[PDB]
Subunit: 315 residues, 4 copies
Amino acid sequence: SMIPDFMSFTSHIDELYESAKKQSGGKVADYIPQLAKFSPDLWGVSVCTVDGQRHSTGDTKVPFCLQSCVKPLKYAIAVNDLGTEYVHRYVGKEPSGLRFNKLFLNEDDKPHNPMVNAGAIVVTSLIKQGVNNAEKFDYVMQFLNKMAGNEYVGFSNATFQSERESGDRNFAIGYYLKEKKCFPEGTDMVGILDFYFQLCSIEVTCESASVMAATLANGGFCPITGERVLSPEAVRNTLSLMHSCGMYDFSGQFAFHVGLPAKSGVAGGILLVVPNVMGMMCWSPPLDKMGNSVKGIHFCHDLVSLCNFHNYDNL
Amino acid sequence: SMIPDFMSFTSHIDELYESAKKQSGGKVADYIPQLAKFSPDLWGVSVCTVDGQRHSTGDTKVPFCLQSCVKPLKYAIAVNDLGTEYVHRYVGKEPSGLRFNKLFLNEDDKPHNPMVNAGAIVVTSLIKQGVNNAEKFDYVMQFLNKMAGNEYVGFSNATFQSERESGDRNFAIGYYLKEKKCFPEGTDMVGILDFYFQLCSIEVTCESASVMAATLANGGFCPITGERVLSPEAVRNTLSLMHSCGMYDFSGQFAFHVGLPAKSGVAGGILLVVPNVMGMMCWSPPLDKMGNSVKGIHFCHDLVSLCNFHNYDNL
Amino acid sequence: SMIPDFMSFTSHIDELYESAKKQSGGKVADYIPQLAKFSPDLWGVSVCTVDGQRHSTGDTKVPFCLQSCVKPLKYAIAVNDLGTEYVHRYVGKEPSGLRFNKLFLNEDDKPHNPMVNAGAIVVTSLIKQGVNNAEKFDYVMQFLNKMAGNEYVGFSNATFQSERESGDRNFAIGYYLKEKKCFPEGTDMVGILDFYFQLCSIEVTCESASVMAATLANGGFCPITGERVLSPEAVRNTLSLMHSCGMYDFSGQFAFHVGLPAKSGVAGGILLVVPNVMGMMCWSPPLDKMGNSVKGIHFCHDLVSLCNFHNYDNL
Amino acid sequence: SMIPDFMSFTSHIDELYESAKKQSGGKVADYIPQLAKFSPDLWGVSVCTVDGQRHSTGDTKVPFCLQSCVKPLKYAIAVNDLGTEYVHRYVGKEPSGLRFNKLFLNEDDKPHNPMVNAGAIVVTSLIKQGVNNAEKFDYVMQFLNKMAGNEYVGFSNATFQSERESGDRNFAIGYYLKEKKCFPEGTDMVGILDFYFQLCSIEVTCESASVMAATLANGGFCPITGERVLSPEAVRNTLSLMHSCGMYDFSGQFAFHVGLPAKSGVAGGILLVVPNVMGMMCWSPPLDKMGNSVKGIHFCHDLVSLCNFHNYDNL
């Protein structure tokens, strides 16, 4: 363990939080009203060690949608229940060459990885096949509750309704994937898109999400309940992909300068994982040109520079 | 440390080595005679712990050219002497989108990363600027001797002469980079290509190379001499890039399944690094379709499955 | 005029027809049953001079769907009613760079040209805006009757029903274009796709289609009725685009070796135009790897070699 | 013939010339001093009918380099002496997909067409193989004299010396093509580049160049000497390619709106051909963003709108 005195570490988090707060750049997403609503000044950071120790600063109890932050989570679910081999017969394992979410498959006609939209949609089509969307959703919700140690996990129907009503881009991807035979046989494509929009609309708080991150950072065991939620294989796979495909077009830079598994979302969230150390959720609505929370990105750089948490930092 | 009993670990290495030996697929490179010469049955594996403990099995004393295995090493040199910021004004920090070595620059007209040929050529143009090629070469040689703890570091003039005589592809890249203004002002492009061919022709043995790898795995300190060879910054940067761009078009798969910083070469070498644990050099001339040593790749998968060395394996 | 003695020209057409008949290669399209039905031995060639002189050989009265052969026709309609400037605010004027129908827009986010599917779909959304699909269809049908001098113009409901039922690729393009704002404001995208499938299902015979081609070859005047059907501007634009984008991925080769405006279709039809000379329709179900009628392509090469009809043949 | 009264046509040319003169936009090329030298106000237009009738207006006797305008001419030479089949074993027959001169080969590893630099370089390697550059150059010069009916055909050694001294982009292409085995066996690549730079440095005047264009417009017969200079096959091939690849990235637009075979050059020249009618050379140093003479382009549009010379204009 690299945190001898938690109380002192906490004091540092507050300093970094305070410093990041001064970064007011960026634009709050506004393609749908449910996202445009948010104030650019909301800024929260919650920590949950593999130990179970907690600490929050800022707006850590204001609910917000996971959006893309849910991608690694549902992927982890798929691998947990189906295994690496099966899941990857449908999706790739690496960074798409060019632009993130450019819409095209790889050599084998599979979405490049679970973190791009086309890949997440395919992953969504693998979860609990056979049952209706109602049960599929309950199943995943239950799974997220376990990851969060039963802390806040809500749902935003307005985000859901708005996402579906204006999701022409996802429907295009939906039909494209169906024509390329990317879905398991007999898949109700439109039904999967519906399930996908719902998953993007699940709400969390920095506090509950930090626990989910902590579960990933703790070999798949929820730090505040001690129960096994995800298989070791699922966690390792998820972390590998968050390392290289979790920050959209900034993934390459992030891995190089921060070197930590992470996943951003258009709501301004950044699910951050420090292997065997802790889980975190940084949240601030204003996004940079690449879709990542401006304050969150600033905070992540500072965190690694201060505490030497970089994957390849020697210790 | 994850190696309680070295002697027992050694016994496992031999088993994995023995298993990999049965893999006879692949083709020995033959674009130049100096590479076609080699027997497909040569197979060696040398280990050098951060501790300084050694172990070899197979053809670990037969000299062979580093080829691309030198890319991370000269990059480490550049960062060590010039710093991250300066070096990266000329080269990128992430996986090139499409085909490896496709020849094109990124958004900012810089080679995508130090591991592709265009990038290595640019990196080469940054080392000890101002002096002639003779001194530049001595300088790097001295540096490699330190990385190897003064073990075998030779030079193959025939590989050098053959590489230069048939390097039309590199000359095309040379002129392309010059026209795009990728070199520091006043650079003798043709002279740099010459220096580059020479660096690709430096010879090592599994034994000496494993020490170089161990130096990278030991925060930049050579395990058998204890002296500081590379700055912490240089090591971290090098390892980050070996993680995502060290195995040509197999880099993505390698990071996902093996999760260790590595760098292959057309001579059949694979410089493997296990952070804070050990350094290794696997060598077998027969290469797969992607340019990686068939036995080496097999061995790397088995090593991680057995000893749980994967970056994100939970422990 | 380059046809002094029509009767003798006719004799040559029969010889070329007879020669092409020996070409049995290719595969009849089978993505839908309505296309797979057809016999590979059907082969017809009908000529209609700007003069009004006719000549058929082979299966020239067997109805078949225009499919892509309708693209230049509906484009001609759009330009005729809206003008060059308006139509091209929505679609490009040149060969898409890479693969034909690769699905992507050009610099200005417009389908590259009216001959690729994305472009034809957009063109379809411009015709008689404001009225329902029933009237839109009647309107175009009436227009085609005029182009054909009231000869055979039918409709295949089964092709229509099958095209719509399995058109996942077109729906993907539909949503993609809608998200990119490629349609005039207020467009019912799904409704346009429906209209598009219907247009692809319109049936003709070699005989009636040759008249349509003759109308294009006659400055927009139907050779057998003498009435003006299309504006000079519409005809010129249509011919320019048929010259460079009418034969899918073979367009470049076709322009170079044949040098005549043409448009192929998956039913095996090839609408061929010889400016100020005649119009033709060659039809044979078996298609080559690029989607063009094998016999038709053979026939077109022979026709130009014999009668020196190539755009740039000196005379 | 579409020019009943030449004298009246002449009067129109002057009007169009006068109108184009008002277009002062664009930038004179300045990558080398020999091009930057030129005044932006130089503007000349020379006509030479298939009849042999002449007419000039403006700066039609000021020498300037053909530059890319020579590409179709040396291609015509290659086909004339080697035939279509042989020449095209080395170069393609159609518009390169993306950016003009992007540097990449097509499916068969051949430069896309004779009009892009990579293709012109390959074509250059086919002319009079076996003899030294001195004879190769004399041979082509003699050939151009015949095309020009012995009118002005000079050579700019300074352009040549400057082109070679700063041609890093062409050397990159040179080595790239050599590595891809695009040259006939035993080709001295560097020697070919030298010959290529020389060809780009050949000087003409609007007057002499218009005759060259007239020769192409006259089935390969020089209008003012009556002798056969190029084979019918050579002329047709050249014109087909000038139609689709002669105006860089504006080729598509040009074919659609102007519909005439043409070839621009960085010196500001535009070799224009009106089949069976006349040949022209428009020249004005200021170029637009796509590398085409601003006045020349304006003039070409006006010429077609006024005299209905468009390939597919009905008459």
